[PDB]
Design an enzyme around this catalytic site. Structure first.
Site, PDB file in Angstrom:
ATOM      1  N   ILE A   1       0.832  -1.216   0.000  1.00 37.17           N
ATOM      2  CA  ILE A   1       0.000   0.000   0.000  1.00 37.17           C
ATOM      3  C   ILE A   1       0.855   1.249   0.000  1.00 37.17           C
ATOM      4  O   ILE A   1       1.822   1.297   0.709  1.00 37.17           O
ATOM      5  CB  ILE A   1      -0.890   0.043   1.257  1.00 37.17           C
ATOM      6  CG1 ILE A   1      -1.665  -1.279   1.401  1.00 37.17           C
ATOM      7  CG2 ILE A   1      -1.843   1.239   1.210  1.00 37.17           C
ATOM      8  CD1 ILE A   1      -2.366  -1.527   2.731  1.00 37.17           C
ATOM      9  N   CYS A   2       0.466   2.244  -0.783  1.00 34.02           N
ATOM     10  CA  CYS A   2       1.116   3.538  -0.795  1.00 34.02           C
ATOM     11  C   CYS A   2       0.227   4.611  -0.134  1.00 34.02           C
ATOM     12  O   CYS A   2      -0.603   5.268  -0.769  1.00 34.02           O
ATOM     13  CB  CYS A   2       1.456   3.941  -2.218  1.00 34.02           C
ATOM     14  SG  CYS A   2       2.421   5.487  -2.305  1.00 34.02           S
ATOM     15  N   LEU A   3       0.432   4.794   1.160  1.00 34.73           N
ATOM     16  CA  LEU A   3      -0.374   5.706   1.959  1.00 34.73           C
ATOM     17  C   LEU A   3       0.553   6.506   2.950  1.00 34.73           C
ATOM     18  O   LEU A   3       1.170   5.897   3.839  1.00 34.73           O
ATOM     19  CB  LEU A   3      -1.407   4.850   2.687  1.00 34.73           C
ATOM     20  CG  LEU A   3      -2.239   5.594   3.729  1.00 34.73           C
ATOM     21  CD1 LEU A   3      -3.300   6.455   3.040  1.00 34.73           C
ATOM     22  CD2 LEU A   3      -2.812   4.645   4.760  1.00 34.73           C
TER      23      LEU A   3
END
EC number: 2.3.2.23
Lengths: 105, 182
Positions: free
Chosen positions: B117-119
């Protein structure tokens, strides 16, 4: 397991048969913007396989949808698009063939 | 030394918050969250994608790795994503026990294969202020609010760049239908 992405323009549409979606779970159909999804589904009585059919709104989107799906076989007549010479996108896709060779798979 | 008892506190908290019917936990999307085994440093979570969004009405599974100096460092969190052959075997056990969960995750900010995930919250806007629980709520918010300009899945992101919102949604509905299981 015989994974195929089928992109149907208006013209390609006569090479379709309700039969294909009944029989192959890993077939996935991508409609050109020209082809409305909900009319296509009642015209071939394939409401049961709504999810296997993907309404796209721009020609470009087709290629992203194909690349996202990554099917083993990719049937698409590029000659039936309004866009041309934009082969800017590539061969990420295994086994592209013109849509006319449906019957081979 | 300390981390252990925070993590234990975070667990008890969420345990008891899900036991209450009226608690706000449920509308946040968090269906379940707990440690594996006896080890505190690896966790499972189940979330429900948020309403008025193409991820609505479906569950997903997440695996959570906790670093030892947590909460100073963030947890590593990923969606559990399997190959098409592993999913079709899981589907053969169709006796409709616990719940259906979907094992593919098609979103611009998650990596289609790894489940990564890219958060911002997880990559060093993290702070000890955050908990596992609020990081999860953050991820469900991300599902409704993809960020196309920070993509880990180029193709899903490009559907948004085209403004092809229907292709985005059909495709999300596709994966959920074809690739869920118990």
């Amino acid at each position: 397991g015989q994974s195929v992405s089928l992109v149907l323009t208006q013209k390609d549409l006569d090479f379709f048969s309700a039969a294909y979606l009944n029989e192959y779970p890993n077939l996935t159909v991508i409609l050109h913007p020209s082809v409305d999804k909900s009319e296509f589904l009642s015209r071939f009585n394939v409401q049961r396989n709504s999810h296997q059919v993907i309404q796209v709104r721009t020609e470009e989107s087709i290629f992203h949808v194909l690349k996202q799906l990554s099917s083993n076989i990719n049937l698409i007549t590029l000659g039936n698009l309004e866009m041309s010479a934009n082969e800017v996108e590539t061969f990420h896709l295994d086994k592209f063939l013109t849509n006319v060779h449906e019957v081979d798979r | 030394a300390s981390t252990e008892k925070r993590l234990l506190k975070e667990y008890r908290a969420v345990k008891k918050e899900l036991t209450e019917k009226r608690s706000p936990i449920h509308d946040t999307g968090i269906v379940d969250l707990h440690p594996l085994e006896d080890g505190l440093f690896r966790w499972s979570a189940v979330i429900r994608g948020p309403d008025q969004s193409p991820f609505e009405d479906a569950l997903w599974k997440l695996e959570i790795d906790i670093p030892t100096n947590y909460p100073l460092d963030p947890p590593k969190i990923k969606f559990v994503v399997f190959g098409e052959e592993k999913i079709r075997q899981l589907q053969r056990k169709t006796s409709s026990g616990a719940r259906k969960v979907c094992y593919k995750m098609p979103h611009p900010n998650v990596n289609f294969k790894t489940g990564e995930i890219c958060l911002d919250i997880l990559q060093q806007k993290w702070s000890p202020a955050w908990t596992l629980q609020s990081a999860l709520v953050a991820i469900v918010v991300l599902l409704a609010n993809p960020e196309p300009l920070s993509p880990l899945n180029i193709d899903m992101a490009n559907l948004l760049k085209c403004d092809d919102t229907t292709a985005y949604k059909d495709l999300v509905h596709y994966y959920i239908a074809k690739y869920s299981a118990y």
